[PDB]
C-alpha cells in the first residue's frame, strides 16, 4: 500500500516468510509436496507406507524444511521444521486415513435403516469411497484435497475482511497458574512475530484515511481554513494539516489516502469530540 500510494518509505525485510513450508505441504504444481505426494499415492496399485516414505524422501529430500527423525526411525519417519518447532511425524496408516475407505454394504444398510436419525445421517452416500484391485463427477476427492478446498475458501474470506488478530501465549506445559516460563514464552514471541508486528506500527503508519473521508471527519477542527467553495480533495487536506500544526514526521500524503503515525487519529478523535461537546449536550 505504501508503494502504491507513492510516499517516502523504504522496504524493510523482516525475514518472516513461511512460504517455503506452505509450498512443500500444499504446492501441487512443480515439485510435488507432502499433500500432493500423498494424493498421487492415494491409489492402490503398488503404493504402501514404506514406498510412500521412500518417494517423499526422494522427492522432497533437499528441501531446507525437511530432516530425518533423530538418528534412526524409532518413532518417526520425517520432520518438518515448522515456524514453532520441529515435529516428528509417523507415516503409519496415512494412506487409509487419506482415502477413508468404507464398506459399501454396511453403508447402504445404514442408509436404508429403519431409524429416522440413522437414515438422515447416512442420507448422503454418493461421496463414499471403497474400491480395491480419477474424477467421478469430482466426488473422488481425498481427505487432504477436501481440507485444502475448505481452507482455501476460509483464507479467501478472511482476506476480504479486516482481521483482528488476538495472540494467545501459554505460560508453561505444567498447567500451573502464576508460573511463567521465559524460555517457552521467548520461543513463542519469536515465531508469532510479536516483536516484528510492533516495529511496523511504530516505524510505519498503521493509520490511513481517504482524502474525502478525512475532510468531513475532521473539518470541525479547522473550519476557517479551506476556502468556502470547491477545492481538490488532495490539496484540501494539505490546508487542514497545515492549520492543525502537525509535524511533518507524523503524516505522509499519497495519491489517494493520507497516512498517519500510530496515535495521531486518537488525538484528533478526542479533540473532535471536545469541539462538538457543546453541540451534543
Amino acid at each position: 500500500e505504501y508503494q502504491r500510494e507513492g510516499i517516502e518509505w523504504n522496504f524493510i525485510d523482516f525475514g518472516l516468510d513461511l512460504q517455503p513450508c506452505i509450498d512443500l505441504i500444499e504446492k501441487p504444481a512443480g515439485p510435488p509436496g507432502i499433500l500432493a505426494l500423498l494424493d498421487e499415492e492415494c491409489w492402490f496399485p503398488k503404493a504402501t507406507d514404506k514406498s510412500f516414505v521412500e518417494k517423499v524422501m526422494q522427492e522432497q529430500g533437499t528441501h531446507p524444511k525437511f530432516q530425518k527423525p533423530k538418528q534412526l526411525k524409532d518413532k518417526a519417519d520425517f520432520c518438518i521444521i515448522h515456524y514453532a518447532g520441529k515435529v516428528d511425524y509417523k507415516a503409519d496408516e496415512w494412506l487409509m486415513k487419506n482415502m477413508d475407505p468404507l464398506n459399501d454394504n454396511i453403508a447402504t444398510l445404514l442408509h436404508q435403516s429403519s431409524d429416522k436419525f440413522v437414515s438422515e445421517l447416512w442420507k448422503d452416500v454418493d461421496r463414499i469411497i471403497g474400491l480395491d484391485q480419477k474424477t467421478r463427477k469430482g466426488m473422488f476427492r481425498t481427505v487432504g484435497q477436501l481440507y485444502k478446498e475448505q481452507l482455501a475458501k476460509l483464507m479467501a474470506t478472511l482476506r476480504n475482511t479486516n482481521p483482528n488478530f488476538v495472540r494467545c501465549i501459554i505460560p508453561n506445559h505444567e498447567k500451573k497458574a502464576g508460573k511463567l516460563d521465559p524460555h517457552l514464552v521467548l520461543d513463542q514471541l519469536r515465531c508469532n512475530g510479536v516483536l516484528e508486528g510492533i516495529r511496523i506500527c511504530r516505524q510505519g503508519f498503521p493509520n490511513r484515511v481517504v482524502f474525502q473521508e478525512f475532510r468531513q471527519r475532521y473539518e470541525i477542527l479547522t473550519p476557517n481554513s479551506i476556502p468556502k467553495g470547491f477545492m481538490d480533495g488532495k490539496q484540501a487536506c494539505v490546508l487542514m494539516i497545515k492549520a492543525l500544526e502537525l509535524d511533518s514526521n507524523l503524516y505522509r500524503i499519497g495519491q489517494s489516502k493520507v497516512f498517519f503515525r500510530a496515535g495521531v487519529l486518537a488525538h484528533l478523535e478526542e479533540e473532535r469530540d471536545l469541539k462538538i461537546t457543546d453541540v451534543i449536550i
Binding site: 487409509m96 477413508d100 475407505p101 468404507l102 464398506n103 459399501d104 454394504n105 454396511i106 453403508a107 444398510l109 445404514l110 435403516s113 429403519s114 431409524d115 440413522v118 438422515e120 445421517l121 447416512w122 463414499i128 480395491d132
Partner: protein, 98 residues
Amino acid sequence: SGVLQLGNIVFKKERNTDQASMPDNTAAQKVSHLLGINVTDFTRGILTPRIKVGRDYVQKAQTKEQADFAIEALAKATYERMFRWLVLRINKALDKTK
C-alpha cells in the same frame, strides 16, 4: 451408544483359512438394535462384503485385521456424520430469524 458398542466384536482367526469369524455376536446384535438395522445382513457385509470384481458380484473375503479396520472406519464415518448433522442443526437453529 452404538458407536461405543462398535469394536467389541472380538473377531477370531479361522484355523483352516484366513477368514474373520464372529463367535460372539452379542455386540453386533446390540449395535444393530441401536442403529436400527438387521444383524444377519450386517454380519454378512462385515465378514463377506458383496462387491463386483468387474462384471458380476462376488462375496469377497475379509481377515481379522481387515474386519477391525473396516469397523474402525465405519465408526469414524458415523461419528463424523453425527458431528456434521449436529453442526447443521445448530446452524439452522441459529439462522432462523431474518
